[PDB]
Amino acid sequence: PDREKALELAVAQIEKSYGKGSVMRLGDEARQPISVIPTGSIALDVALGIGGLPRGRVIEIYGPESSGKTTVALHAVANAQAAGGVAAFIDAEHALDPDYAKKLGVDTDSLLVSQPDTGEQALEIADMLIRSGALDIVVIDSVAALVPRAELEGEHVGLQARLMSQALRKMTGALNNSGTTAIFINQLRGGKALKFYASVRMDVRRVETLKDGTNAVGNRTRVKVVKNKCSPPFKQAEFDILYGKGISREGSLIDMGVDQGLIRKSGAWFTYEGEQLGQGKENARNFLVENADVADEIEKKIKEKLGI
């Protein structure tokens, strides 16, 4: 007790001097904010502690080419919009499939999109939009492609990382005031700065291909929250990304349903509330999309349990 008070004291000071979430026990509960941006997977939302991505903060989603990181970012955009928010996409990759985006739920027609000339222009344009205070979310695709005017014009050579540092300093201010979430997408082969400014960092991988007899359906995706200033870090989540359709909300609800024991098994059968969802995972998955009311109740109960 003599020790516990001096430690609590120490933490309180640390917290007051450097920010809430500057230290925490990994077992601690998450302090729930007013609103967050759901990710598209409840499993990830849970892994994230606060039921989704935080507002007013920088976020980094990284992984190899074709890992699903864009898909996660696109789902963030869809939810933000679905709650009546405005969204922006700073595109230096020129890779966006809007039909795909549309099928996830993105209102593409009303999605702001910029295809910048340079790295600095991209980040300036980003800041300018953020300072409006009219945006809920902005996605920057991508870090690697934020090439500096000088490099794009002719001719020292370490300045791209310096451009990101400078830009993030400014942006972080604007983001905090505005309540806008910035997502940076990033490859593996200016991340040195982003790594520290980011309140959340998500490591995304493809784990394995999905079945459909002899032809596939998609990829089981794994995400580790390697950095989280809003809740205990180092948590991970797994969910399914189905080609042309995105994250299986339904499949994620089942997985977490059984994880929490709200959903039970009678062998291959999935029980809920004493009634059967389906035999095998895909019928359960299909049953939930055809029956939205019960899918929302499963989600309802999952959040009630975890306080998400």
8 is a domain residue: no
Q: Specify whether 92 is located in the same domain as 234.
A: yes
26: Cβ contacts below 8 Å, ≥ 6 apart:
232, 233, 234
Q: How many degrees, rounded to 5, is the angle at CA 77 between CA 38 and CA 67?
A: 85
12 is a domain residue: no
Rounded CA separation 34/49 (Å): 13
Contacts 24+ apart (CB under 8 A), 204-212: 204/61, 204/62, 204/63, 204/67, 204/68, 204/69, 204/72, 205/63, 205/64, 205/67, 206/64, 206/66, 206/67, 206/68, 207/238, 210/240, 210/242
**Which amino acids are annotated as binding site for ATP, given as ranges?**
63-70
Q: Specify whether 267 is located in the same domain as 228.
A: no
144 is a domain residue: yes
93: Cβ contacts below 8 Å, ≥ 6 apart:
141, 142, 145
Backbone angle region of 25, left / alpha / beta, with phi > 0 → left and psi within -120 to 50 → alpha: beta
Q: Which pair of structure tokens corresponds to residue 230? A: 């809003």
Q: Specify whether 76 is located in the same domain as 211.
A: yes
Picking from 74, 67, 229, 200, the residue whose alpha carbon sits closest to that of residue 141 is 74
Q: Can you give the CATH number for the domain in which 230 is found?
A: 3.40.50.300
Rounded CA separation 256/296 (Å): 13
Q: How was it solved?
A: X-ray
Dihedral (CA of 87, 91, 93, 95) sign: positive
Q: 77 and 139 in contact (C-beta within 8 Å)?
A: yes
Q: Specify whether 232 is located in the same domain as 287.
A: no
Q: Specify whether 254 is located in the same domain as 290.
A: yes
Q: 205 and 62 in contact (C-beta within 8 Å)?
A: no
Q: Can you give the CATH number for the domain in which 264 is found?
A: 3.30.250.10
Picking from 216, 180, 232, the residue whose alpha carbon sits closest to that of residue 48 is 232
Give the domain range for residue 227.
Answer: 24-247
Q: Which pair of structure tokens corresponds to residue 247? A: 């994250």
Q: Specify whether 119 is located in the same domain as 178.
A: yes
Q: Specify whether 252 is located in the same domain as 242.
A: no
285 is a domain residue: yes
Rounded CA separation 125/75 (Å): 23
Three-state SS at 236? strand
239 is a domain residue: yes
CA dihedral 110, 35, 223, 305 (to 10 degrees): -130
Q: How far is CA 21 from CA 33, 37, 202, 228, 237, in A?
A: 13, 19, 17, 8, 21
Domain count, the chain: 2
4 is a domain residue: no
Rounded CA separation 230/228 (Å): 5
**Which amino acids are annotated as binding site, given as ranges?**
63-70
83: Cβ contacts below 8 Å, ≥ 6 apart:
35, 136
Q: Name the helix (H) or strand (E) containing 205.
A: strand 200-209
Q: Which pair of structure tokens corresponds to residue 266? A: 């009678």
